[PDB]
Ligand binder design. Structure first.
Ligand SMILES: [Ca+2]
Ligand SMILES: [Ca+2]
Ligand SMILES: [Ca+2]
Ligand SMILES: [Cu+2]
Ligand SMILES: [Cu+2]
Ligand SMILES: [Cu+2]
Ligand SMILES: [Cu+2]
Ligand SMILES: [Cu+2]
Ligand SMILES: [Cu+2]
Ligand SMILES: [Cu+2]
Ligand SMILES: [Cu+2]
Ligand SMILES: [Cu+2]
Lengths: 425, 427, 425
């Protein structure tokens, strides 16, 4: 058949926990984005629309043909149409791909999902039992970051199944003892490895990449690096109670990646568990505990604020050898399309040094990791507009008077920071 | 056969290097715990006893049947009895499972071990040679943490084979050139991946999860994430000398995960190398150079102490636009069933904000990641008790007078921290 | 056949990005080192020479026989000769092996490379097509570190294919639509996992370790931990354009691990891409923007400098209910054959505590992780010499007068740090 899907690139807000909101980028106002399911040999038609005010694009791992000419560098308001044949069965990632630096920077902000290509060849348990699964479960594991600095460092704030911390503890997935389950698992990462496990289960058959040829049997874990996938076949044992789904990378399980398969003889067949996030929200309620934003300003502001005391060399003349010591500059890094620290408070007389730690400094716009810092809200006498900095390039500003400045990158306008200059009354 | 094993949950202290002690939890006073070996098709009876003052439990990956109802949420002094059939051959992890948050928090404190299910189908090198191994080696790789903060961040202090840094450098494993070795390897993690390697060897046959069907041949490395396992068959080449066992993740090999197979023509046949820690101690000697405790107070105390100077906004009135700036609070995180920083020294007038960074705030007791802070050693006029905080909830306290305080969490009484408040003697 | 290769251990400087220089250790002045290619069943003769002023050695994973007796603990000026038979086909790492602690410490400084053992049994796509590859590509992924602290913590500064950030973006690899490519991939790490991917491709056949028996089919990623390898067979789809080679661990792709296969119908047949770095330099030019050195002093110096104010307990007498508080010591760690922080600036009256965080404290020289700290080129009134510290051992020094001290480890003389003591004028 011919199958058609529409993906819409957008800026969004995701509710990842009770009272916890994440700012980022989506397809169709959900993270993970819409789940696409086709059969091996189908023609797949994609319409990609950019509804945002920055450039986006698309990579789709089910296509064994050129994609970036057709689906990259999609400007604000532009549409693309692309078709391909699904020649390889299994479980595939899709994600945003503006091109260059932006492929990595946008993917980590929420722009990812799953496409399943169901094989003509039946999986082994289906063949052996003469019937299809009693239940199919589709799961994405993914990470959320508090800053571009933390993204470079591999320090995830939350890790989750289908876009919400402990989603399937709050709403346990109903199963029955004796059910043939088929699980479709994709770890999008983007940094951390996963080892998927069910407490009370040994997976009978698993298929690396979801291809029926790549058979592994009798496993306690399914090992998956970023963008690795598996199809897993397992019968629920003939005993009632909770069979917990978890990653055995326990420093990530503790951050949200744990759910429950609740086995009861009379359990209802509910709507299909798709690898899709909850719909995004329109605004942040005033009752929020935390707002996470890797690229821009986050709440509460005080947990992202660095207040620097006066350097000992500025408080008075001090020295080591011959002449007086100069004060040390205070660094603000450009890193992972963000400014680190996000909010800096310094005393009059301090020199700030911007430094670009992003590495890919070719191309332009959302395809580049070059950055500048340009004031957009001026409450002081010393507004600033830095040059555009390549990797490892630097720019110094000395602040001599009190004031407060909100600034952005002109190339990537969702990058935002604050400098405040204080003085004794 | 029917096979019976007894596991005893307890609080323990492990000597992980010369003069270096680690506080945590165990089964039977060793980390890794008792190694269990059965045959495929055996009936396995487990007796679990809780000898500690907090709740514990057990998960056992060789069981393909419901376990949490029968072995979870085991109260202090309680016993459970459970049986299952070993239907699947291989190398399996077992670990503590109070339930919920505690599964992750207790496992990282030391409560893990191995159960092996030997297959009825013989492995390929045994079949080909017509005999069993000349020596079996059972190995667990595991991590130790200085704090729950470091646990969240994946920053291990030590990484080790069978519970002690460079154990098999200090005591090399005797083998002979030409020996048929069979290695049973489990990476328990709980955070880091392993690539097992022997210097001077290429592994002939390997079996993912220890299942004979999952064959990989001719490998320089055996890739294993947390709770992944392998069985490996290899012949020692016909040349004497040291063949070093190591993980090729070299930032973890450097932390303790390296040992020696010492090949000599006249080497005695030693008893099998079991995947079990050295038994623990009851007191820490005065000779100790370091005490590590992820949940509580560590030694020396100064290496875990943050001393804050007076906020510039408190030192005098300061301003940006017009009105004076407020001082920033000093943060104490509850994270990985610990307080971070462990010891905080602040000047009078300072406000502390407790914030709960643990995420799972459901259930109760050892099953929850809710926390409070309650003073239990009062050496000042301002002892305190916070509410019980869920994820991302906060509580502020302003300290106006000098003093010191040791506090715990009432939910998890092994969590411990210190606040000291200082003031110039001139006042 | 009988094949002979010469490896020369030395100290080197690599240009890993434009204007960015990395100090470390090499074979033959390139990182990765020379690529060695043999056939299954060949006798391989190695000549190892140590051209440096510290001990080096060699481990070679293609040898299934004792190596360390013959190639370990190679003193300055020494030569070793070693032969073995290549009995196992695939893609193997080699690296420095002085012994003990130094195996890990030297390998992370750049001393690694690839040896390929081509199988007698033909790979599947070569069998099916009746001909060899149109182009062979040999790729190493490796990491670079700013400090031994960062090495312990898994925090790589750069991650790259064949020794230079975005090398194959700056110079894309020409291919033709329809080409049979065979890729020989080795992740040397030494810490991070990789998931190798081509944008617009699904890998047809892959071989774990490069052994023809270990077949995996139809994959979007090839998962590889440190020292894991693959051989990958893939046909370029019949469409012109760029097919991007990348690791899906996107926090490492963003640090330099991304390249381009540029597909054109009229592309010339270039020479095979060898898994070898760019030859090093003898001096760092005036133009340089960054010098990285995990063991020693880096540039600019101020980005590695910690300046401490006077302890509140030294400023004035303070107490917590009883007698006056003592000041807390300021820690310098010995960790990963380096001092952390690299540069420390402290006020007169401050006590410093050196602590050895390296764990392996047996053996001697480059085989041990024992360390001391000793002032060279003395130009301050209070020079120091610490004892040689084992793991977790400590030593205190109280500084009472102003001055500057450059210091080294006597055991590992390339380790270097600075302490400066300041005083009000
Ligand atoms: Ca919740
Ligand atoms: Ca030791
Ligand atoms: Ca560049
Ligand atoms: Cu995008
Ligand atoms: Cu991709
Ligand atoms: Cu920018
Ligand atoms: Cu427990
Ligand atoms: Cu488990
Ligand atoms: Cu608690
Ligand atoms: Cu070396
Ligand atoms: Cu090696
Ligand atoms: Cu040294």
């Amino acid at each position: 058949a011919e199958r058609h899907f529409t993906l819409e690139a957008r800026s969004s807000i995701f509710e990842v926990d009770q009272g916890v909101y994440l700012r980022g980028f989506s397809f169709n106002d959900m993270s993970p984005g819409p789940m696409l399911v086709v059969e091996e040999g189908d023609t797949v038609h994609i319409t990609l629309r950019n509804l945002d005010n920055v450039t986006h694009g698309l990579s789709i791992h089910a296509a064994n043909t050129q994609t970036s000419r057709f689906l990259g560098n999609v400007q604000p308001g532009e549409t693309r149409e692309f078709s391909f044949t699904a020649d390889f069965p299994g479980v595939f990632m899709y994600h945003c791909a503006p091109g260059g630096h932006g492929i990595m920077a946008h993917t980590m902000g929420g722009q990812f999902g799953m496409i399943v290509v169901e094989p003509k060849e039946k999986y082994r348990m289906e063949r052996e039992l003469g019937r299809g699964p009693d239940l199919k479960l589709y799961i994405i594991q993914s990470e959320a970051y508090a800053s571009g600095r933390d993204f470079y460092d591999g320090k995830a704030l939350y890790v989750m199944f289908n876009g919400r911390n402990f989603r399937y503890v709050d709403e346990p997935i109903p199963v029955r003892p004796g059910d043939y389950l088929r699980i479709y698992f994709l770890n999008v990462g983007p940094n951390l490895t996963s080892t998927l496990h069910v407490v009370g289960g040994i997976f009978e058959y698993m298929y690396y990449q979801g291809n029926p040829k790549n058979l592994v049997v009798g496993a306690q874990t399914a090992l998956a690096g970023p963008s690795d996938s598996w199809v897993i076949e397992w019968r629920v044992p003939p005993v009632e109670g909770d069979y917990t789904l978890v990653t055995h990378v326990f420093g990530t399980a503790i951050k949200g990646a744990l759910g429950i398969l609740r086995a009861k003889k009379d359990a209802p067949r509910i709507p299909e568990v798709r690898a899709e996030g909850v719909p995004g929200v329109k605004e942040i309620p005033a009752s929020a505990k935390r707002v996470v934003d890797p690229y821009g300003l986050a709440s509460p502001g005080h947990e992202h604020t660095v207040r620097v005391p006066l350097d000992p060399a500025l408080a008075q003349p001090v020295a080591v050898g011959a002449k007086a010591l100069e004060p040390l500059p205070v660094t603000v890094q450009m890193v992972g399309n963000s400014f680190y620290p996000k909010v800096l408070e310094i005393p009059v007389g301090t020199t700030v040094e911007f430094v670009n730690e992003d590495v890919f400094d070719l191309l332009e716009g959302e395809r580049t990791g070059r950055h500048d810092a340009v004031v957009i809200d001026v409450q002081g006498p010393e507004p600033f507009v830095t040059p555009k900095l390549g990797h490892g390039e630097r720019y110094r500003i000395t602040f001599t008077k009190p004031g407060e400045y909100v600034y952005i990158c002109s190339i990537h306008p969702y990058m935002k920071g604050i400098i405040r200059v204080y003085e004794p009354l």
